[PDB]
Every structure is written in structure tokens, then in C-alpha cells.
Design an enzyme around this catalytic site. Structure first.
Site, PDB file in Angstrom:
ATOM      1  CG  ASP B  11      13.697  56.034 -19.223  1.00  0.00           C
ATOM      2  OD1 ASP B  11      14.408  55.005 -17.880  1.00  0.00           O
ATOM      3  OD2 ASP B  11      15.003  56.354 -19.529  1.00  0.00           O
ATOM      4  CG  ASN B  59      12.578  46.409 -17.744  1.00  0.00           C
ATOM      5  OD1 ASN B  59      11.112  47.023 -17.426  1.00  0.00           O
ATOM      6  ND2 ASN B  59      13.675  47.250 -18.082  1.00  0.00           N
TER       7      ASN B  59
HETATM    8  O1  LIG Z   1      15.760  52.127 -13.949  1.00  0.00           O
HETATM    9  C1  LIG Z   1      15.045  53.073 -14.608  1.00  0.00           C
HETATM   10  O2  LIG Z   1      15.021  54.324 -13.679  1.00  0.00           O
HETATM   11  C2  LIG Z   1      13.286  53.075 -14.804  1.00  0.00           C
HETATM   12  N1  LIG Z   1      12.338  53.810 -14.772  1.00  0.00           N
HETATM   13  N2  LIG Z   1      11.222  53.471 -14.919  1.00  0.00           N
HETATM   14  C3  LIG Z   1      11.642  52.359 -14.981  1.00  0.00           C
HETATM   15  C4  LIG Z   1      12.241  52.033 -15.335  1.00  0.00           C
HETATM   16  C5  LIG Z   1      12.642  50.215 -15.110  1.00  0.00           C
HETATM   17  C6  LIG Z   1      11.108  49.385 -15.479  1.00  0.00           C
HETATM   18  C7  LIG Z   1      10.321  50.779 -16.403  1.00  0.00           C
HETATM   19  C8  LIG Z   1       9.054  51.901 -15.235  1.00  0.00           C
END
Ligand SMILES: O=C(O)c1[nH]nc2c1CCCC2
Ligand SMILES: O=C(c1ccc(Cl)cc1)N1CCC[C@H](O)C1
Ligand SMILES: [Ca+2]
Lengths: 213, 222
Positions: B11, B59
């Protein structure tokens, strides 16, 4: 951040042992928290020596007896989750009395997880679903998240949005795996016997965004 | 003692893009490169399994342009990884609901897993269209299908039987789960597999995540 919404369902892993709960239950009622779920005895706790298991069974019988008058005075529903097949018969009879006398109470739901594990809960949910399939009530192709979730414990309560772990460890330890899938996790070095309403309230405010970690 | 199975919630891509005043989706573009030194560090140190949360069940409800970029980035990643898996002797796996993914991406995933299935230095798992809830309910559907075929008695379903239908059952349980980006949450990741996992949370946004911090997270586990 103008609006500060408190958690709807708080879960606690009361670690650090090797009467704390009463002011915490009262604080949930005061602040409007709808549910509190505590990890009293785990699936793993059956692997402790027999004298330790026997002592925890006595502490559990004692706690329920002491809680029944409080549940009636405050109009709180008292529930239990976990495998009851491994528990002493008189303790099961006491758990049934407590949950039957309080099931209609609407101020809050206090759930005590006894002989409980997230894995046991999930596999038990899977068993009941497969039983429905065997009895011809449902076809197995209908099994998805929406159908399956209804069989996981506490599905009628809001999802666990705040999970507190006392005792310094950074682990969920097979607690509410499904129910706390999106819960905010609050870890503290404070041992359960030393845990305060002030710190419990701080964890609530960390969730709401009113206070920072 | 080294963790047998490390999982990562990567994240902080979007926060990184906002912080460094980058264009829409650049956090995902920079972020895509971070895992390569981590994967190589895992192989060289002896970590048996690495599982990353590339695209969740949730997602699918992100803005469509973000879903589009993530699908293209996944396709780009898999192509780029296939030669890397062969060089480092890594088995590449995918977990998640494939019925929701583009058909061409599923063919590419099938190709990658089949060509690297014999590799044994490490197992790299990419969780795509994945959610712990989906995984669990899918395992319950498979157990119920076996009940319908008469292979299994429903009365006999317990943890020992059920666990065999959950993804990555042939791998060790997740013993270390890392989450970058500052949030204290499992966010419907390996709910079952990480039931007893040590949890490492960091404020470091995924595009800024280093092998040094990852190595420190392994040290914290030991
Ligand atoms: O939303 C974000 O900032 C984010 N950071 N890493 C990921 C994501 C969304 C999809 C998976 C990997
Ligand atoms: O972070 C990654 C990544 C995974 C595996 C490897 Cl080997 C490299 C990058 N991804 C995959 C592409 C799109 C995802 O959202 C994020
Ligand atoms: Ca059918």
C-alpha cells in the site's frame, strides 16, 4: 474531518495475563458502541496443562454468573461463540441460561468467545453449508461470499471495525479472521489486567480520527 | 530463525503520487519496480515463499481507469517476470478469482505458472482478483461439490478437511505479513493463511520501500 464516527463493533484480544472488562462494557453503552466481542478462551488453549484448563473453566463459570445480573440491569445481550462440544455440560447449561435470558436485550451485544478459533468458525460455517447441500436445501453452485458469510459467527452484528490487542504482540492469533477482515487494528504494550477505560477510549478516538496514534 | 512464508500488502502508491506531485497513476508505475530486489533478497536469503497483494476483490470497485492501469501493469509485470523466474529458479503462482480477469491476462497467467511450476528455490505468488473471503467461500463451494458427488460426508467437515481447499494449502502458513503505507489493517488479504502471522506495519509508502527495511522486518521476526 468534521464527523467523528466511533466503531460499531469492537473486538478485544485480552492478552498479557501470564474485573477489567466491566468499565469497558459500560463505556461502550455510554458512547453508543453496539457490540463488544472478547477472546476469553481459544481453540489453542485446550493444549495447556489440564489444571490450567480446569482453572480457566472455573473462571469462565464465575465470570458468567457475575455477568448475568449486570446484563439484566443494563439490558445488554450476552452471547457466546465457539465449539461447545469440548466444554463441561454445566458450563454449557450456564451459557444457554445466560444467552436465553438476555437474547432480546437491545442496549449492546457482549459476545464472549469460548473454545473459539477463526478457523473453527469458518470450517463450521463450511460444514453447515455442505449439510444444506446434502439435505437438498441448496445447490453447491449457489455458494459464494454472500451465501457463505451468513453462516460465519456474528454475521447479524455489524462487521468488526476495531480490533484491540493488549499484551504487546503484533498478531490476530486465529481470532475473528472473517469478521475483522477490514477492522482497524490497535496494538498496545499495556497488559490486559492494567488496561484502562482511558486507553480503551483513546483506541475508539484513533478509529474515529479524533485522536492520532 | 527466518520466516518460511512472507506476505506483503504493498500500500501507498496513490499517496506517493500525491506527495511527490506526480500524474494520475504514476504511484502504480513507480511501485511496480520495488518488488524485484525484494524477490531477489528472498531467494538469496532462503525465504521459501513470498505472496503479494497485487489486486484485491475490492480493487474491482476502484475508478475504472485505475482498474485499467492495474490490468495493463499486471500483464506488463507477468511478461517481465517470466525470464526472471527462469533465471532465479522461482515458481510463479497466481491466486484469486480468475473469472473476473480479462481472458488474455488469464492465458498469460496460465503460461507463467505452467512454465515455472518445476522451479524449486522459491514460490512467488501474485494475488490477483483475490480476497480472503472469496478464497474461503470458494473452498466451501469445492467442499460442498465433493459432498454432492458423494466423495465426502458433510458431518465429517472440520478444520483439517477444510484447510485442504483454501489457496496455498501446499505451502507453509504465512508467518510474516508486511503492510506498507501506514494503515493498520489486513484488508481481506490472506485471512486463513496468516491466522498466526507476525504483523509488520510501516509508514513507508510502497514506492519508497527498500530491501534494507524488508531485511529489518525479517530481523524483527527473528
Ligand atoms: O491504492 C493504492 O495506493 C495502492 N498502493 N498499492 C496498491 C494499490 C492499489 C492496488 C494494489 C497495490
Ligand atoms: O506490485 C506489483 C508487482 C507484483 C509482482 C512483481 Cl514480481 C512485481 C510487481 N504489482 C503487479 C502489477 C499491478 C499491481 O497492482 C502491482
Ligand atoms: Ca449444481
Amino acid at each position: 474531518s468534521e464527523e467523528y464516527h466511533l466503531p460499531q463493533h469492537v473486538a478485544i484480544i485480552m492478552d498479557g495475563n501470564n474485573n477489567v472488562l466491566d468499565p469497558i462494557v459500560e463505556h461502550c453503552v455510554k458512547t453508543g458502541v453496539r457490540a463488544l466481542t472478547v477472546f476469553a478462551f481459544s481453540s489453542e488453549n485446550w493444549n495447556r496443562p489440564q489444571y490450567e484448563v480446569d482453572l480457566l473453566m472455573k473462571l469462565l463459570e464465575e465470570t458468567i454468573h457475575e455477568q448475568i445480573p449486570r446484563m439484566k440491569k443494563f439490558n445488554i445481550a450476552l452471547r457466546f461463540i465457539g465449539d461447545r462440544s469440548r466444554l463441561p455440560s454445566h458450563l454449557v447449561a450456564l451459557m444457554e441460561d445466560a444467552e436465553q435470558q438476555t437474547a432480546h436485550h437491545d442496549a449492546m451485544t457482549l459476545t464472549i468467545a469460548v473454545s473459539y478459533g477463526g478457523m473453527w468458525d469458518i470450517a463450521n460455517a463450511a460444514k453447515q453449508v455442505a449439510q444444506a447441500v446434502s439435505r437438498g436445501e441448496i445447490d453447491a453452485d449457489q455458494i459464494n461470499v454472500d451465501l457463505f458469510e451468513k453462516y460465519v459467527s456474528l454475521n447479524d452484528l455489524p462487521a468488526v471495525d476495531l480490533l484491540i490487542r493488549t499484551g504487546g504482540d503484533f498478531r490476530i492469533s486465529n481470532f475473528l479472521l472473517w469478521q475483522a477482515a477490514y477492522a482497524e487494528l490497535y496494538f498496545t504494550d499495556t497488559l490486559w489486567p492494567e488496561f484502562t477505560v482511558e486507553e480503551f477510549d483513546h483506541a475508539l478516538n484513533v478509529f474515529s480520527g479524533r485522536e492520532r496514534r
